[PDB]
């Protein structure tokens, strides 16, 4: 139990862990040690998501005939337009070429839909 | 059978909080991203997996 | 052994683990526990 305690003083307090149910339940933020007789009392600051909402997804989008893949994030939709946001939070943005990756054609990936990829360089060179 | 469910069904988020809805073809793409494999490998080779 | 068996549920099963030769040989994806008498049987999915 003390070797389990000396690990969690090293891992949870002195550093950041990605682990589940080691530094406490949920995503680890930080840990606060406290003094205790014949032991130690840990205060685990945890990151818990609360409320959920169902969105419409797709693995890839199709524009010119080449398949577009996300770099870091998810594909969401409100039922009308396709939006891009990250995995742990919802911050909807337009789909840009810097936020996507181009590999393959549209005849491979099952579930690809037609979309319009916004190029930021096209209004910049025309103005 | 509840833990064999939510590994396939709910992803990795059932023990870390409330269970999200992630479909299973997108779950293996994020597990490739932790070991350094981009999503080009999964979606092309999916019939060979 | 049960403290190691509770560690494999918290690491190899409920999340993604980047460890080497903890969750099995190679890069780790996910783990499938099975019911067993006086123990537990793990089915690991590895990337070789």
CSV table of C-alpha atoms in Angstrom, one decimal:
chain,number,residue,atom,x,y,z
A,1,UNK,CA,0.0,0.0,0.0
A,2,UNK,CA,2.9,2.4,0.6
A,3,UNK,CA,4.5,1.4,-2.8
A,4,UNK,CA,1.1,2.2,-4.3
A,5,UNK,CA,1.2,5.5,-2.3
A,6,UNK,CA,4.7,6.3,-3.4
A,7,UNK,CA,3.7,5.8,-7.0
A,8,UNK,CA,0.7,8.1,-6.7
A,9,UNK,CA,2.8,10.8,-5.0
A,10,UNK,CA,5.1,10.6,-8.0
A,11,UNK,CA,2.6,10.1,-10.9
A,12,UNK,CA,-0.5,12.1,-9.8
A,13,UNK,CA,1.0,14.9,-7.8
A,14,UNK,CA,4.4,15.6,-9.4
A,15,UNK,CA,3.1,15.0,-12.9
A,16,UNK,CA,0.2,14.6,-15.3
A,17,UNK,CA,-1.4,11.3,-16.2
A,18,UNK,CA,-3.7,10.2,-19.0
A,19,UNK,CA,-4.9,7.2,-17.0
A,20,UNK,CA,-8.4,6.2,-15.9
A,21,UNK,CA,-9.2,5.1,-12.3
A,22,UNK,CA,-5.5,5.6,-11.2
A,23,UNK,CA,-5.4,9.3,-10.2
A,24,UNK,CA,-9.2,9.3,-9.7
A,25,UNK,CA,-12.3,8.8,-11.8
A,26,UNK,CA,-12.4,10.7,-15.1
A,27,UNK,CA,-9.7,12.7,-16.9
A,28,UNK,CA,-6.8,13.7,-14.6
A,29,UNK,CA,-6.1,17.4,-13.9
A,30,UNK,CA,-3.9,17.5,-10.8
A,31,UNK,CA,-3.7,16.1,-7.3
A,32,UNK,CA,-3.3,17.7,-3.8
A,33,UNK,CA,-1.6,15.7,-1.1
A,34,UNK,CA,-2.6,16.2,2.6
A,35,UNK,CA,-1.1,15.0,5.8
A,36,UNK,CA,-2.7,12.1,7.7
A,37,UNK,CA,-1.7,10.0,10.8
A,38,UNK,CA,-0.4,6.6,9.7
A,39,UNK,CA,-1.1,7.3,6.1
A,40,UNK,CA,-1.9,10.0,3.5
A,41,UNK,CA,-5.1,11.6,2.2
A,42,UNK,CA,-5.3,12.5,-1.5
A,43,UNK,CA,-7.4,15.2,-3.1
A,44,UNK,CA,-8.0,14.3,-6.7
A,45,UNK,CA,-9.1,17.2,-9.0
A,46,UNK,CA,-10.9,15.5,-11.9
A,47,UNK,CA,-12.4,16.5,-15.2
A,48,UNK,CA,-16.0,15.2,-15.6
A,49,UNK,CA,-18.2,15.9,-18.6
A,50,UNK,CA,-21.8,16.5,-17.7
A,51,UNK,CA,-24.6,16.9,-20.3
A,52,UNK,CA,-24.7,15.3,-23.7
A,53,UNK,CA,-26.4,16.1,-27.0
A,54,UNK,CA,-26.8,13.8,-30.1
A,55,UNK,CA,-25.3,15.1,-33.3
A,56,UNK,CA,-25.1,13.7,-36.9
A,57,UNK,CA,-21.7,12.4,-38.1
A,58,UNK,CA,-19.9,11.0,-41.1
A,59,UNK,CA,-16.4,9.5,-41.4
A,60,UNK,CA,-15.4,11.6,-44.4
A,61,UNK,CA,-16.6,14.4,-46.8
A,62,UNK,CA,-16.3,14.6,-50.5
A,63,UNK,CA,-15.6,17.8,-52.6
A,64,UNK,CA,-13.6,17.5,-55.8
A,65,UNK,CA,-13.6,13.7,-55.9
A,66,UNK,CA,-10.8,13.3,-53.3
A,67,UNK,CA,-11.7,12.2,-49.8
A,68,UNK,CA,-11.0,14.6,-46.9
A,69,UNK,CA,-10.0,13.3,-43.5
A,70,UNK,CA,-9.9,15.2,-40.2
A,71,UNK,CA,-6.6,15.9,-38.5
A,72,UNK,CA,-7.7,16.5,-34.9
A,73,UNK,CA,-11.4,16.6,-34.2
A,74,UNK,CA,-14.8,15.2,-35.1
A,75,UNK,CA,-17.4,15.8,-37.7
A,76,UNK,CA,-20.8,17.0,-36.4
A,77,UNK,CA,-24.0,18.3,-37.9
A,78,UNK,CA,-27.1,20.1,-36.7
A,79,UNK,CA,-29.3,18.6,-39.5
A,80,UNK,CA,-28.5,21.2,-42.1
A,81,UNK,CA,-24.8,22.2,-42.4
A,82,UNK,CA,-21.8,20.1,-41.6
A,83,UNK,CA,-19.6,21.5,-38.8
A,84,UNK,CA,-16.1,20.6,-37.5
A,85,UNK,CA,-15.2,20.7,-33.8
A,86,UNK,CA,-12.9,18.8,-31.4
A,87,UNK,CA,-13.5,15.6,-29.6
A,88,UNK,CA,-14.1,16.6,-26.0
A,89,UNK,CA,-16.1,19.8,-26.6
A,90,UNK,CA,-18.4,21.4,-29.1
A,91,UNK,CA,-17.1,24.6,-30.8
A,92,UNK,CA,-18.6,24.6,-34.3
A,93,UNK,CA,-16.4,26.1,-37.1
A,94,UNK,CA,-16.4,26.0,-40.9
A,95,UNK,CA,-14.4,23.3,-42.7
A,96,UNK,CA,-11.1,24.6,-43.9
A,97,UNK,CA,-8.1,23.0,-45.8
A,98,UNK,CA,-5.8,23.6,-42.8
A,99,UNK,CA,-8.2,21.6,-40.5
A,100,UNK,CA,-8.5,18.6,-42.9
A,101,UNK,CA,-6.2,16.1,-44.7
A,102,UNK,CA,-6.6,14.9,-48.3
A,103,UNK,CA,-6.0,11.2,-49.1
A,104,UNK,CA,-7.7,8.8,-51.5
A,105,UNK,CA,-10.8,9.2,-53.6
A,106,UNK,CA,-14.5,9.1,-52.6
A,107,UNK,CA,-15.1,5.5,-53.9
A,108,UNK,CA,-13.3,3.8,-51.0
A,109,UNK,CA,-14.7,5.0,-47.6
A,110,UNK,CA,-18.1,3.8,-46.7
A,111,UNK,CA,-20.3,6.6,-45.5
A,112,UNK,CA,-18.7,9.6,-47.3
A,113,UNK,CA,-21.1,12.5,-48.1
A,114,UNK,CA,-20.8,15.4,-50.5
A,115,UNK,CA,-19.7,18.8,-49.0
A,116,UNK,CA,-18.0,22.0,-50.0
A,117,UNK,CA,-14.6,22.5,-48.5
A,118,UNK,CA,-13.9,26.2,-47.9
A,119,UNK,CA,-10.6,27.4,-49.2
A,120,UNK,CA,-9.3,30.5,-47.3
A,121,UNK,CA,-6.8,31.4,-50.0
A,122,UNK,CA,-9.5,31.9,-52.7
A,123,UNK,CA,-11.1,35.1,-51.3
A,124,UNK,CA,-7.6,36.3,-50.3
A,125,UNK,CA,-6.1,36.2,-53.8
A,126,UNK,CA,-9.2,37.7,-55.3
A,127,UNK,CA,-9.2,40.7,-52.9
B,1,UNK,CA,-21.3,-8.5,-20.5
B,2,UNK,CA,-21.9,-4.9,-19.5
B,3,UNK,CA,-18.2,-4.1,-19.8
B,4,UNK,CA,-17.9,-6.1,-23.0
B,5,UNK,CA,-20.8,-4.0,-24.3
B,6,UNK,CA,-19.5,-0.5,-23.5
B,7,UNK,CA,-16.0,-1.0,-24.7
B,8,UNK,CA,-17.5,-1.7,-28.2
B,9,UNK,CA,-20.6,0.5,-27.7
B,10,UNK,CA,-19.7,3.5,-25.5
B,11,UNK,CA,-16.0,3.8,-26.3
B,12,UNK,CA,-13.5,4.6,-23.5
B,13,UNK,CA,-15.8,7.2,-21.9
B,14,UNK,CA,-18.0,4.9,-19.8
B,15,UNK,CA,-15.6,4.7,-16.9
B,16,UNK,CA,-14.3,8.3,-17.2
B,17,UNK,CA,-17.8,9.8,-17.0
B,18,UNK,CA,-21.2,9.5,-18.6
B,19,UNK,CA,-21.3,7.3,-21.7
B,20,UNK,CA,-21.1,9.0,-25.0
B,21,UNK,CA,-22.3,7.7,-28.4
B,22,UNK,CA,-19.4,6.9,-30.6
B,23,UNK,CA,-20.0,4.5,-33.6
B,24,UNK,CA,-17.5,1.6,-33.8
B,25,UNK,CA,-15.8,2.4,-37.1
B,26,UNK,CA,-14.7,5.8,-35.6
B,27,UNK,CA,-13.5,4.1,-32.4
B,28,UNK,CA,-10.6,2.2,-34.1
B,29,UNK,CA,-9.5,5.4,-35.8
B,30,UNK,CA,-8.9,7.2,-32.5
B,31,UNK,CA,-7.1,4.1,-31.0
B,32,UNK,CA,-4.8,4.2,-34.0
B,33,UNK,CA,-4.1,7.9,-33.3
B,34,UNK,CA,-2.6,7.2,-29.9
B,35,UNK,CA,0.0,4.8,-31.3
B,36,UNK,CA,0.9,7.2,-34.2
B,37,UNK,CA,-1.2,5.7,-37.0
B,38,UNK,CA,-3.3,8.2,-39.0
B,39,UNK,CA,-6.8,7.4,-40.4
B,40,UNK,CA,-5.5,6.5,-43.9
B,41,UNK,CA,-4.8,2.9,-42.8
B,42,UNK,CA,-8.2,2.0,-41.3
B,43,UNK,CA,-10.6,3.3,-43.9
B,44,UNK,CA,-8.8,1.9,-47.0
B,45,UNK,CA,-8.0,-1.5,-45.5
B,46,UNK,CA,-11.3,-2.0,-43.7
B,47,UNK,CA,-12.3,-5.1,-45.7
B,48,UNK,CA,-9.0,-6.7,-44.9
B,49,UNK,CA,-9.4,-6.1,-41.2
C,1,UNK,CA,-2.4,-10.4,-8.2
C,2,UNK,CA,-5.9,-8.9,-7.8
C,3,UNK,CA,-4.3,-5.4,-7.6
C,4,UNK,CA,-2.7,-6.1,-10.9
C,5,UNK,CA,-6.0,-7.5,-12.2
C,6,UNK,CA,-7.7,-4.3,-11.1
C,7,UNK,CA,-4.9,-2.4,-12.9
C,8,UNK,CA,-5.6,-4.1,-16.2
C,9,UNK,CA,-9.3,-3.2,-16.1
C,10,UNK,CA,-8.4,0.5,-15.4
C,11,UNK,CA,-5.8,0.6,-18.1
C,12,UNK,CA,-6.1,-2.0,-20.9
C,13,UNK,CA,-9.9,-2.3,-20.8
C,14,UNK,CA,-11.5,1.1,-19.8
C,15,UNK,CA,-9.0,3.2,-21.8
C,16,UNK,CA,-6.3,3.3,-24.4
C,17,UNK,CA,-2.8,2.3,-23.0
C,18,UNK,CA,0.5,3.3,-24.7
C,19,UNK,CA,2.5,0.8,-22.5
C,20,UNK,CA,4.8,-1.9,-23.9
C,21,UNK,CA,4.4,-5.5,-22.7
C,22,UNK,CA,1.8,-4.6,-20.0
C,23,UNK,CA,-1.4,-5.0,-22.1
C,24,UNK,CA,0.3,-7.6,-24.3
C,25,UNK,CA,3.0,-7.7,-27.0
C,26,UNK,CA,2.9,-4.8,-29.5
C,27,UNK,CA,0.9,-1.6,-29.7
C,28,UNK,CA,-2.3,-1.8,-27.7
C,29,UNK,CA,-5.9,-1.2,-28.9
C,30,UNK,CA,-8.3,-2.6,-26.4
C,31,UNK,CA,-8.9,-5.6,-24.1
C,32,UNK,CA,-11.8,-8.0,-23.6
C,33,UNK,CA,-12.4,-9.5,-20.2
C,34,UNK,CA,-14.1,-12.9,-19.8
C,35,UNK,CA,-15.6,-14.6,-16.8
C,36,UNK,CA,-13.5,-17.3,-15.1
C,37,UNK,CA,-13.7,-19.4,-11.9
C,38,UNK,CA,-11.4,-17.9,-9.2
C,39,UNK,CA,-10.1,-15.3,-11.7
C,40,UNK,CA,-10.6,-13.5,-14.9
C,41,UNK,CA,-9.5,-14.2,-18.6
C,42,UNK,CA,-8.3,-11.2,-20.6
C,43,UNK,CA,-8.5,-11.1,-24.4
C,44,UNK,CA,-6.1,-8.5,-25.7
C,45,UNK,CA,-6.3,-7.0,-29.2
C,46,UNK,CA,-2.7,-6.1,-30.3
C,47,UNK,CA,-1.2,-4.2,-33.3
C,48,UNK,CA,1.8,-6.2,-34.8
